[model samples]
Target chain A: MDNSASKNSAISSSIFCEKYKQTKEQALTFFQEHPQYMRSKEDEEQLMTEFKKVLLEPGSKNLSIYQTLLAAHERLQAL
Target chain B: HMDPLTPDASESVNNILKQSGAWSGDDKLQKWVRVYLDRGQEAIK
Candidate 1:
């Protein structure tokens, strides 16, 4: 199936990673600038856990963080 | 991580964030508690 990471969409906090993309470091910096995006502890942990799952996956540690960032943006939209 | 905030600011912000995540205030200079509901004088001691 499509798995996840549906498509390119704009909605602040986007970092336009899909539009261009970057490593998790810069992507996370984008998030830091807008901490107001944070809503609840549960949601925070949920996101952290999601990132953990992906980063732990077998890879050269390259795309995993990128995936995590885009995935985070995707989930952020849900909130 | 980059250098951040002083404990005063950090604690204040984190305090807001912690309960805000889970739950703000009255109005008083460093004293948000002034009005006593005084239900059976419960507030004043």
Candidate 2:
């Protein structure tokens, strides 16, 4: 299977925290609710690392992180 | 027969909302603006 082509999980814990104004616990629940986001161990770890960085050093900055977070929120709302 | 309308104040504001989104939800910036306007948004509802 071509993993990259099909597996398109573009979310992380801390960014999720930013979007819905909830932290890791909720984000964990988020991943739990949708196993696809938590599919691979490596992928989950990557999200973990991203979330840690977001927590350890907080600041007002930007990138694609915005879309990823809110997009998930919209997805959740859609469901 | 017709009675004079009291005029719907919300009608005026809601019309503006059709053109633009209501301002900030409940953030600090909105608070400052609320101070400036001595009033608020969310469509007069």
TM agreement with the true structure for every prediction: 0.32, 0.26
The CAPRI class of candidate 1 is incorrect
Candidate 1 lDDT, tens digit per residue, A1-79? 2574434445546332332333323544544564433766665556555544534443433333445455555664574
What is candidate 2's lDDT per residue for A1-79, written digit by digit as tens?
2442422244554432233333223444455575433466665445444443442243332323343333434543352
Q: Extract clashing residue pairs from model 1.
A: B19-B23
RMSD of each: 24.1, 18.2
Candidate 2 residue runs with Cα over 4 Å from true position: A1-25, A36-38, A60-79, B1-45
Chain B TM-score (each prediction, in order): 0.13, 0.26
Measured by lDDT, the strongest candidate is: 1
Give fnat for candidates 1, 2 and onward, in order: 0.00, 0.00
List candidate 1 segments past 4 Å from native: A1-28, A33-37, A58-60, A72-79, B1-45
Please provide, for model 1 over B1-45, each residue's C-alpha lDDT reduced to its tens digit, 9 standing for 90 to 100.
Answer: 877865653443533444443111111110111111111112221
